[PDB]
Amino acid sequence: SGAIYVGNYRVVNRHLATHNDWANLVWEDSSRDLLVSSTTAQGCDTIARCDCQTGVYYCSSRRKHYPVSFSKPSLIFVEASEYYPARYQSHLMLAVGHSEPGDCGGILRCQHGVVGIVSTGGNGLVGFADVRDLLWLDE
């Protein structure tokens, strides 16, 4: 689990969105596994606006933050799960790192701010849904 709290927005994995998120919906995209809802309180996270390919992510299944090198956001095939059929997910970045299903939502960050959140994984890989192109999160 986990979210990004920037301005009056809450960014979560679409597959983990709550009823309150759907009832206060700002934007959602199944192909990216992202959903953004509105918040009453202002958040403290800042979004990175950069082309970093190295950063650090939080892994809840280890209670640890790990440094990683990650691929550029791309269209990657994701196998069928209990949340989606087998499909291509867009704006996804892959890295070598530990992950379990419940790790979704952990933040990936670089020196400039939040880059994205954990969205896929398995067998010593971890995938992050990028948010750096969502310029509207800053206003």
Ligand SMILES: COc1cccc(NC(=O)N2CCC[C@H](C(N)=O)C2)n1
């Ligand atoms: C997060 O790490 C792991 C580790 C092992 C397995 C998994 N499951 C995983 O990738 N998916 C299940 C949740 C929805 C994901 C998606 N974005 O389509 C696919 N995740």
Ligand SMILES: [Zn+2]
């Ligand atoms: Zn950066």
